[PDB]
Amino acid sequence: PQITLWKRPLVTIRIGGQLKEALLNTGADDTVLEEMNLPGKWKPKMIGGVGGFIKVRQYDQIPIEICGHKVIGTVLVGPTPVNIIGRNLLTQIGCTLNF
Amino acid sequence: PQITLWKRPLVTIRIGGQLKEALLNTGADDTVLEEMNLPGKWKPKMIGGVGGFIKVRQYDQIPIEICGHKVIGTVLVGPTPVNIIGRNLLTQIGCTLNF
């Protein structure tokens, strides 16, 4: 699709049986989801934004479905105010910014 | 143009006599520039992001040139880690996300 930017570009994603609303975010290097449980090993990471840093858990090789696209990558979990799909996954769905 | 997302989507903008690097950011409602001394009135404002909130100054109807497009709108100024072009100005240049 072509997604206009009049409103926040929110989409529903699926992660192992769970639906989540997430923001397609060209200003994010990484994908970050609000606190939730995920299987497998993880390691702590600090990520920064407007307003400073937060501690997140880093989970690698997680499969997610985003707008009908089945992708696999790193998912960070922690206190982001909104779920974020970052460039690590936007590149996998073939997303570009067009004007 | 069609901007891929393998690297951060940074562009040069021109605001008055100043040239700056800025991030084309679909995850930002508003445009926020690093501290600078713009003409005219301003209202203080709080904005939130990944690490919490920061305080900024809101200036309205400021002209900026972005990728050869002249836009005129609201610019926030404050301690942002990177200059950000948000959806308020992305829409004025006719930006969409495509995949």
């Binding site: 923001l23 975010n25 200003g27 994010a28 290097d29 990484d30 970050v32 990520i47 920064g48 934004g49 407007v50 840093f53 982001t80 105010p81 909104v82 974020i84 970052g86 | 991030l23 950011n25 995850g27 930002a28 409602d29 508003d30 926020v32 404002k45 709080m46 904005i47 939130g48 992001g49 990944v50 880690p81 990177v82 950000i84 948000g86």
Partner: peptide
């Protein structure tokens, strides 16, 4: 940084 989500 990271992750430049921003809102008002």
């Amino acid at each position: 940084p990271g992750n430049f989500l921003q809102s008002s």
